[PDB]
């Protein structure tokens, strides 16, 4: 019943005291955070409190969309020796700091995601050459489907790959994806290995990567410029915004204190120093 | 009335009983007492084995030595208890297996010693590596130290043999080993053994994972890390030392899918 | 639905419990045929394209 938008408990008036009750004392040893209120130690007047936690509820903490990647595509001239670059990005929040740290506060979570795609383009060669408005395709290849090979092979016939066709110069594109985990919650951390090295086998085939699980494998996104070759080369970038919605979490962990290094929890040398200098005696 | 102390506790599971006089009460992690897999959240279809008493009993891991140079110690579950009688056995003979735990970290000094040990129960305790060139590379053997456990260190030392890398952990203490500030560690279920007050810690952890039941040999659920909050000093003594012993205990454990015995290359 | 360790499936195997015995003047080597299928509790999800066909050009 107590919703997020409820007023915090009104602080009671309390006067002088000389009793055997000891509020003030604890023994953090138990592990219990001593639960005192202002009125417990000092004298308080009555106060009708109006502040509510409404803007810090799990929902609101993740309520902002966030950049997750920068995918590069381009459409060079047909005369060019280099091949028309189509980008393929594996879907993982771990590619950028920002969302990851916000997600790390929790061991597990269930969240239906909403993706937004802002696509910006530009010329490269200093030619007063033109280019007609381009049309992009963002194809979601789920784990195991054939990943595109050429900017123009069959794979793009999207028989079943849910795709999006975005014309440039229009409002950014957006799609909703429900919770797609193979579990009951997405694992932000996986302690263990996929393969158990067996006693009657080669170490090679018995070896995997620590903290690498399928739990967080979700296929790739394929992006290409649909318009064919154009005399004047035009590169473009596709920024992907992810905003977790209908979110819920489990088990708090301490926030990441030193610069992240790679997909694991691992850290690099030099970066292991977070706090600064300050004196024990200077306020 | 009958002087029942929150210092005098008695834990009993299976054929063992651990009493205690200087306890700091006990913590039931997250406020959920362990329990058997429900039918609402059941998953695998075959009948589940419930070893009960044959498994629900206090096993004692090997004791460690607490000194001034002790930086910390760490143990994974069910890992550590992989050689513990039937629970050790029932662990290898199944694909799936969920289990709770009751960790009773004992360690006493005397009114003349001082210091503080924080027993933390980190769910999904992923530890950091030793090489600064290769991520998440640590090998299985190193990752699962068993009943002996591994230890924290005062400084990060990179693994420089790229010919034959050590592939082990090198967890730096103040960073709770996984690049986070220790001072915050207090968010996971825990208790502090402060030599002046108590001589044991008691955390009861209910199975916590992303699945209903999972592979034991593969994925470690819990992580018990013990770090010295306040260093150990005694008398006017240059070399004080008191031992710390962990006695863990599986609870409400159940396994599914009997097969042939798994023999893991532990070395 | 792909080759993955984490979510591997297991192994099926067939072994002679006894041995196949035949009387005299009978083919000494006979064969078996195997069939697979889903039970009533089988279900799939999240449609994707297939690797079992390709149109080159």
């Amino acid at each position, epitope marked *: 019943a107590a919703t997020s938008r409820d007023a915090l408990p009104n602080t009671e008036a309390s006067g002088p005291t000389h009793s055997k009750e000891i509020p003030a004392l604890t023994a953090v040893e138990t592990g219990a955070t001593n639960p005192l209120v202002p009125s417990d130690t000092v004298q308080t007047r009555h106060v009708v409190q109006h502040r509510s936690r409404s803007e810090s509820s799990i929902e609101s903490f993740f309520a902002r969309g966030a950049c997750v990647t920068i995918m590069t595509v381009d459409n060079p001239a047909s005369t060019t020796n280099k091949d028309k670059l189509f980008a393929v990005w594996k879907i993982t929040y771990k590619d950028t700091v920002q969302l990851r740290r916000k997600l790390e506060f929790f061991t597990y979570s269930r969240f239906d995601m909403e993706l937004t795609f802002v696509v910006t383009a530009n010329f490269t060669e200093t030619n007063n050459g033109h280019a007609l408005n381009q049309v992009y395709q963002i194809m979601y290849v789920p784990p195991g489907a054939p990943v595109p090979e050429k900017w123009d092979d069959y794979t793009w016939q999207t028989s079943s790959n849910p795709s999006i066709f975005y014309t440039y110069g229009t409002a950014p594109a957006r799609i909703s994806v429900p919770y797609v985990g193979i579990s009951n919650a997405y694992s932000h951390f996986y302690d263990g290995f996929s393969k158990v090295p067996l006693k009657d086998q080669s170490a*090679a085939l018995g*070896d*995997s990567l620590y903290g*690498a699980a*399928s739990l967080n494998d979700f296929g790739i996104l394929a992006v290409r410029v649909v318009n064919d070759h154009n005399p004047t080369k035009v590169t473009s970038k596709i920024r992907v915004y992810l905003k977790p919605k209908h979110i819920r979490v489990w088990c708090p962990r301490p926030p990441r204190a030193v610069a992240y290094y790679g997909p694991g929890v691992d850290y690099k040398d030099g970066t292991l120093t977070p706090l600064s200098t300050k004196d024990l005696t200077t306020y | 009335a009958c002087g029942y102390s929150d210092r005098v506790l008695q834990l009993t599971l299976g054929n063992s009983t651990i009493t205690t006089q200087e306890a700091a009460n006990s913590v039931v992690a997250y406020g959920r007492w362990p329990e058997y897999l429900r039918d609402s959240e059941a998953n695998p279809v075959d009948q589940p084995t419930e070893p009960d008493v044959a498994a629900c009993r206090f096993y004692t891991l090997d004791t460690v030595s607490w000194t001034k140079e002790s930086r910390g110690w760490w143990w994974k579950l069910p890992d550590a208890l992989r050689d513990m009688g039937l629970f050790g056995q029932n662990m290898y003979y199944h694909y799936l297996g969920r289990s709770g735990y009751t960790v009773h970290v004992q360690c006493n000094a005397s009114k003349f010693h001082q210091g503080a040990l924080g027993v933390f129960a980190v769910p999904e305790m992923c530890l950091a590596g030793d090489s600064n060139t290769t991520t998440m590379h640590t090998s299985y053997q190193n990752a699962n130290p068993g009943e002996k456990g591994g230890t924290f260190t005062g400084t990060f030392t990179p693994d420089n043999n790229q010919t034959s890398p050590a592939r082990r952990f090198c967890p730096v203490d103040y960073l709770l080993g996984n690049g986070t500030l220790l001072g915050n560690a207090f968010v996971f279920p825990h208790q502090i053994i402060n030599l002046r007050t108590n001589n044991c810690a008691t955390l009861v952890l209910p199975y916590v994972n992303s699945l209903s039941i999972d592979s034991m040999v593969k994925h470690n659920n819990w992580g018990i890390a013990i770090l010295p909050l306040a260093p150990l000093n005694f008398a006017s003594e240059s070399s004080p030392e008191i031992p710390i012993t962990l006695t863990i205990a599986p609870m409400c454990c159940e396994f599914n899918g009997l097969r042939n015995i798994t023999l893991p290359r532990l070395q | 639905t792909i080759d993955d360790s*984490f979510t591997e499936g297991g192994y099926i195997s067939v072994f002679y419990q006894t041995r196949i015995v035949v009387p005299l003047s009978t083919p000494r080597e006979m064969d078996i045929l195997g069939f697979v299928s889903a039970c009533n509790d089988f279900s799939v999800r999240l449609l994707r394209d297939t690797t079992h066909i390709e149109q080159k050009a």
Partner: nanobody
Amino acid sequence: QVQLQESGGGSVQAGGSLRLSCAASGYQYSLLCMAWFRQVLGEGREGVAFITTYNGAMRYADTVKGRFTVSQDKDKNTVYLQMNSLKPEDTAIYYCAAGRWRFGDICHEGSGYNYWGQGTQVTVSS
């Protein structure tokens, strides 16, 4: 298709040290399992050392192990092969293959390798 632009052979004598560079053209990220090889003149076409793109873990061939070290240029998509102690028998047409990957499984020889390199030959004179 992934392209593996290799570089750059030569027949220096015993004990020598050269190196091969091979690009991801290609989309080096989580996929490719950049491996090394050398075709022992018609005998002959063995796998030298192989690196994992995702983590940077190397494995070598029982022959090359130690002398040869596989290096990785993550950001500029190149995988090197510091060919050390080049002895006369280090005469063979070198290779650079790169397959895909198993999410978490280490890049080994029994695993890859879908795509092929140029095959730039390095010979060790006698």
